[PDB]
Design a protein around this ligand. Structure first.
Ligand SMILES: Fc1ccc(-c2ccc3c(c2)[nH]c2ccncc23)cn1
Ligand SMILES: Fc1ccc(-c2ccc3c(c2)[nH]c2ccncc23)cn1
Ligand SMILES: Fc1ccc(-c2ccc3c(c2)[nH]c2ccncc23)cn1
Ligand SMILES: Fc1ccc(-c2ccc3c(c2)[nH]c2ccncc23)cn1
Ligand SMILES: Fc1ccc(-c2ccc3c(c2)[nH]c2ccncc23)cn1
Ligand SMILES: Fc1ccc(-c2ccc3c(c2)[nH]c2ccncc23)cn1
Lengths: 75, 75, 75, 75, 75, 75
């Protein structure tokens, strides 16, 4: 005989209050970029990125995160 | 005979209060960039990034995080 | 006979109060960058990053974190 | 004989630059107001104001002012 | 004979630069107000103000001011 | 014979630079106010103000001021 009771209770709270949020300024890559190449030999795969790439401004009002995992394994 | 009771109780709290949040300024890469190359031999894979890349401004109002794992293993 | 009772109680608290938060200035890479190369031989993989990359401004209103793990193992 | 030449030259400048302007919160009179009167005799004019009156939020983008007066008086 | 030349030259400058401006919070009169009166005799004019009155939030982007007066008086 | 030349030259400058400006909090009158009166005789004009009145939050981006007066008087 085997009896297993799995009764986790979650009454938790993840909250945030922000009176005002803003005046955010993100300016990447305002400088001049010059790339001058001459007599280059590439014998394999080439990946090149020039300029302003993949810059992120992320401004969530809350941005609160809850991660919870439940696992019952029986053998 | 085996009896197992799993009754965790969570009444916890993750909170934040912010009266005001802002006036954030992020300016990466305002300087001039010059890359001058000549007579380079590459015999394998090349990855090149030039400029302002992957800069992040992240401004969450709360940004509060709760991670909780529950694991019951029986053999 | 085996009896196991797992009843952890969490009434904890992770809180923060901030009256005002801001006037944050992050300026990486305002200086001039010059890279001048000549007669370089590369016989293997090359990774190159030039400029202002991967700079982070992270300004959470709370930024409070709770991590809790529960593990009951029976053999 | 009387000769009068009035030739003022104005090449002046009143300018302003604002990158962003906002997140302004004005909350007057959030408190409870109770006025309880009994057996008052007024024998003349009465002016009464109760509550939230005449509060101003004024947010001009420039709000720049130039005042100039020119006066030539001859007798 | 009388000769008068009035040639003032104004090449002046009143300027301002603001990168960001905001997150302004004005909360007057959040407290409770109670006024309890009994058996008052007024024999003349009465002016009464109770509550939150005439509060000002003034947020100009520039708010720059130039005042100049020119006066030529001849007798 | 009378010769008068009035040629003032103004090449002046009133400037300001502010990288960011904000997170301003003005909270007047958060306390409770109680006014309890009984058996008062007023035989003349009465002015009364109770609460939060005439509070000012003034946040100009520049707020720069130039005042200049020119006066030529001849008798
Ligand atoms: F289905 C998807 C969804 C998303 C992406 C994805 C997102 C972001 C980036 C990316 C790929 N590669 C990068 C390199 C440098 N910086 C940022 C990124 C690819 N496949
Ligand atoms: F079905 C889909 C859906 C999305 C994408 C996807 C999204 C974002 C990016 C991407 C691919 N590759 C990148 C490289 C650099 N930076 C960003 C990205 C592809 N397949
Ligand atoms: F599905 C996805 C989703 C996201 C990405 C991803 C995100 C960010 C970056 C990335 C890849 N490579 C980088 C290199 C340097 N700095 C930042 C990043 C790829 N695949
Ligand atoms: F033609 C006009 C135009 C405007 C007004 C005017 C404006 C503002 C106010 C006012 C009168 N009396 C007040 C008392 C207390 N606080 C503010 C004010 C009267 N006549
Ligand atoms: F033709 C006009 C045009 C305007 C008004 C006018 C405007 C504003 C206000 C006013 C009168 N009396 C007040 C008392 C308190 N607070 C504000 C005001 C009267 N006559
Ligand atoms: F035409 C006009 C224009 C404006 C006003 C005016 C403006 C502001 C106020 C006012 C009168 N009396 C006050 C008492 C206390 N605090 C502020 C004010 C009257 N007449």
């Amino acid at each position: 005989s085997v009896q297993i009771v799995y009764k986790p209770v979650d009454l938790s709270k993840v909250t945030s209050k922000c009176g005002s949020l803003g005046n955010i300024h993100h300016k990447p890559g305002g400088g001049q970029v010059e790339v001058k190449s001459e007599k280059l030999d590439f014998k394999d795969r080439v990946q090149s990125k020039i300029g302003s790439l993949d810059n992120i401004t992320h401004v969530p009002g809350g941005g609160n995160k809850k991660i919870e995992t439940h696992k019952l394994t029986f053998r």
